[PDB]
Amino acid sequence: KAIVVQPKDTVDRVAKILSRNKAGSAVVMEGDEILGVVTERDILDKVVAKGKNPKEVKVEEIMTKNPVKI
Template structure:
């Protein structure tokens, strides 16, 4: 089974200049924990709810004055829609991440989350192993 078979295609993206306040509202409205930061269809970074908590709130910064580019993770690990779900699960475990932006011809096409692998009952052991590694901090 390929990533395209389980990924979420309807995703919101934000611009590098988007405020953290705006991003948090978007996360709440869409019930998601991460949002890709894009310029057009090119992925520049990703922001997670954890980034907002640790890099803004815990540091006492003003959510209205911090923008996506200030706190995004710019070394984004991605997969392509034609990669196998086994490989996506392994990449998540190896990198201790729960979500991967999905690219098609270098452009954002969707996102695949660890939950997508589990919810779809795909390689549940792999998804479970990936989650265990992520939760415990895999050592390599």
């Protein structure tokens, strides 16, 4: 299961949404534009392990948005 969230949703909010819905990931949508995806791995690896405060991080900042790239 994945849940659709908005790009300004903060990481603390997104984490609760995912846990309470027993979802593994979110789909980040701005209106009818799908901008990227975010998993619980992204939350732990890009925010928590990185020393960032989840309430100060918008989910757009940690989603997979771009192709792989050297």
